[PDB]
């Protein structure tokens, strides 16, 4: 197997310790934990709460004992991590191997003249994170996955294969694979580079061969091109993928193989005709989104980060800005998968922290571009976020170096930044870029347009109370391509900001842009609560349960993108309004408060053309449970979310009703998170219990490595006890 998990039976233990890298050292009683892993979700120790009186980091320690065969003595091993956060150091059998300070980039170590072949083997890392982390929340550890690499000494050079399309029609693709082949020995010889590429159906559409004589230096080389025929060109509405296989081959046989998954497609950009997708015009319906999974902390499952893409997909996002580092693998393959366009972007800040910029911008952006370069998904390259002092000779130049860094590795997609505060004085930092993100800078489209009519716009970061206008901004303007929501998705450091809470659902703003970007009619009602829910989106709910205030006036806004929308209570009209332009999508009903139902008539052209309801919720009387998946792969990795809500007879979730919940699993499973999305909670996320939050909570199962059934419980006071089967 040339590249396999890497993530099963390790050990982990939390602060500092003594030999933590020896091979003496008695570790029989650490703590048993299988990769992706995070320890500040983890309750504080001594405390019941990942949260301080806000999460703490510091030091820990992974090791792993690991077996390699005989067999393969000669070859060449290596052990990578897509991830650690942050500041790791590894050893191999009580030497040290590497220091790696970036969390968020991949780094792969060779570790083949610290192994031993026939025997067991020793990998330990010390993780330190040491940092403030207030803006958002990290995580600390081994937090993505890792692999375990063998190859001959005579292979392709990790991420030295870069597939372009220089030519991507309907009628016909060009595909251009250039490769990289380390050759360890310097060894002389006449090697086959073979290029095969397959389509969904792991077909053979083309193939091509070339016989390669080794240049003599450590690394050769080598590239060719191939035509596909008619090609299924990769898109946002048909995600296609191909995938090329490259073989070397000596003497017949197989010295290495890798295959990289791709999407045939055309990107343009210009201030005229704005984004082209296959040369067609479109404008990027975007959101940010930072790297957490909520109730899982920094936990890159494959799984997590596929709901994720997927759950943003169904609210109508096209496009996401990675802010403000590389993303894990796992979130690319689902973006290539699922068809969402990406901004990938390398740092934050560059020197106003922080102490090792300097030194390792470079490693760390190659790191991304060089990952990532594959990915049909990707389709910008950031290189920071509201840089600081942006107009200084000194950090147009930094901004320069970046810029002509990542082109040395890519030229096939535009470099670009996100910039606040943009100013006349602002040129000379925008200049090198190809695209240039504006954020919050929606007064300035117009007149940097008179200024430089070359210039191409994105919002990289707009308001939620803001939508309608910086919406409208992106439709006006050609040299506008779209507009990036701070932020898509809510994240720990917590914000309430998103579209989507930290459980995954989707919030009144996220109604109020569907109202901007959906081709069908839409009309959501929303309330305004008579106490404020917390101690800037305006602060309203979506249900209709206000006990105790029977009579007094309820603001009842509704979003909608129709003509006139009639709102009712009851049954008795509250009168018909008009969508006017000065409404900005969203009409208002001051309706005295009565139990019952809220009903919103839309019309476009005099015509009825949808209707929509909020009714209040009776008292509470079961348990609800339901799960995305109720079958997953007993692999040890695979998820399950379960959402929990209190329900009344009709099915209706009280969002009144804020109880605990005790969880538990029967079968070979565990419990790896609970949450809501309450964002003052400080609850535990790894505990067996949970409050509900407005009638809700959410569990995630982990599986286990057997199959069989899977049975999660849910208790609540006063009522039955529920319980949902996954296999």
Same mark, same amino acid.
């Given at each position: ?13 939390? #602060? ?70 942050? &500041? ?19 780094? =792969? ?47 392709? =050079? ?50 091509? =061969? ?45 010295? $290495? ?38 109730? %899982? ?13 997927? *759950? ?19 979130? *690319? ?7 969402? %366009? ?42 920071? &976020? ?60 117009? +007149? ?13 970061? +707009? ?39 930290? +459980? ?40 209709? &349960? ?51 139902? *809220? ?35 007993? $692999? ?23 109880? *605990? ?42 599986? #286990?490595?057997?199959? #069989? ?13 529920? +319980?949902?089967?996954?296999?």
């Amino acid at each position: 197997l040339r590249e396999q998990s890497f993530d099963e039976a390790w050990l982990f233990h939390r #602060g500092d310790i003594a030999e933590g890298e020896k091979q003496s050292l008695d570790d029989s009683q650490w703590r048993q934990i299988n990769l992706p892993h995070d320890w500040s979700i983890e309750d504080i120790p001594g405390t019941n709460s990942p949260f301080t009186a806000f999460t703490v980091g510091g030091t820990g320690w992974y090791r792993k004992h690991f077996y390699i065969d005989a067999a393969e003595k000669g070859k060449c091993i290596a052990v990578s991590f897509d991830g650690i956060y942050m &500041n790791a150091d590894i050893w191999v059998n009580d030497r040290h191997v590497a220091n790696h300070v970036y969390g968020y980039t991949a780094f =792969e170590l060779d570790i083949t003249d610290y192994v031993r072949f026939g025997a067991e083997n020793l990998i330990a890392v010390r993780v330190k994170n040491e940092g403030m982390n207030c803006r958002w929340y990290t995580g600390s550890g081994i937090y993505r996955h890792t692999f375990l690499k063998i190859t001959n000494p005579l292979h392709f =050079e990790t991420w030295g294969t870069f597939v372009t399309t220089p030519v991507a029609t309907a009628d016909k693709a060009e595909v251009h694979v250039q490769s990289v082949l380390a050759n360890t020995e310097k060894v002389t010889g006449k090697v086959i580079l073979e290029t095969r590429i397959v389509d969904k159906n792991n077909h053979t559409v083309a193939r091509k =061969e070339q016989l390669v004589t080794l240049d003599n230096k450590e690394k050769t080389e080598v590239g060719h091109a191939l035509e596909v025929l008619a090609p299924q060109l990769w898109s946002i509405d048909n995600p296609y993928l191909y995938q090329v296989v490259n073989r070397l081959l000596q003497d017949d046989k197989v010295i $290495d193989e890798e295959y990289i998954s791709i999407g045939i497609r055309n990107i343009a950009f210009s201030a005229e005709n704005g984004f082209q997708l296959n040369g067609k015009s479109m404008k990027l319906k975007g959101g940010c989104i930072h790297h957490d999974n909520g109730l %899982l902390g920094a936990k890159a499952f494959d799984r997590a980060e596929e709901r994720k893409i997927e *759950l943003l997909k169904a609210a109508g996002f096209n496009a996401l800005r990675l802010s403000h580092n590389p993303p894990s693998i796992a979130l *690319l393959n689902a973006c290539d998968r699922l068809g969402m %366009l990406v901004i990938d972007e390398a740092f934050d800040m560059w020197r106003y922290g922080a102490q090792y910029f300097d030194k390792l911008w470079k490693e760390d952006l190659h790191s991304m571009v060089a990952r990532d370069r594959n990915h049909p998904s990707v389709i910008m390259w950031s290189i920071g &976020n509201e840089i600081k002092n942006k107009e200084t000779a000194e950090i147009v130049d930094i901004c320069r170096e970046l810029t002509g860094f990542v082109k040395t590795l890519d030229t096939t997609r535009p470099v670009t930044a996100g910039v606040n505060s943009i100013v006349d004085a602002t040129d000379d930092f925008l200049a090198p870029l190809d695209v240039c993100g504006y954020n919050y800078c929606l007064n300035r489209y117009e +007149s940097d347009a008179k200024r430089h009519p070359d210039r191409i716009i994105y919002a990289s970061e +707009s308001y939620a109370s803001q939508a309608y206008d910086y919406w409208k901004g992106v439709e006006d303007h050609s040299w506008v391509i779209g507009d990036f929501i701070w932020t898509a998705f809510d994240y720990i450091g917590h914000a309430n900001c998103g579209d989507l809470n930290l +459980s995954g659902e989707r919030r009144p703003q996220s109604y109020l842009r569907e109202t901007l970007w959906s081709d069908a009619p839409v009309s959501h009602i929303v309330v305004t609560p008579p106490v404020p829910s917390f101690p800037d989106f305006p602060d309203v709910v979506d249900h209709w &349960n206000f006990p105790g205030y029977e009579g007094k006036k309820m603001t009842v806004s509704v979003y909608s993108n129709c003509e006139q929308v009639e709102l009712f209570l009851n049954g008795e009209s509250l009168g018909k309004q008009e969508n006017t332009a000065d409404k900005k999508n969203t009409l208002v009903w001051e309706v005295p408060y009565a139990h019952g139902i *809220l009903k919103a008539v839309s019309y476009n052209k005099g015509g009825e053309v949808g209707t929509a309801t909020l009714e209040s919720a009776g008292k509470v009387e079961k348990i609800r449970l339901s799960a995305d998946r109720t079958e997953i792969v007993a $692999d040890g990795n695979d998820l399950s979310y379960i959402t929990l809500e209190l329900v009344d007879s009709k099915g209706i979730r009280n969002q009144l009703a804020e109880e *605990l919940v005790a969880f538990s699993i029967e079968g070979d499973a565990t419990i790896e998170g609970v949450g809501n999305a309450n964002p003052m909670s400080i609850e535990s996320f790894v505990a067996n219990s949970r409050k509900t939050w407005r009638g809700s909570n959410l569990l995630v199962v982990r599986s #286990g490595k057997s199959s #069989g059934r899977i049975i999660v419980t849910a208790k609540v006071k006063a009522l039955p006890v529920a +319980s949902i089967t996954i296999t």
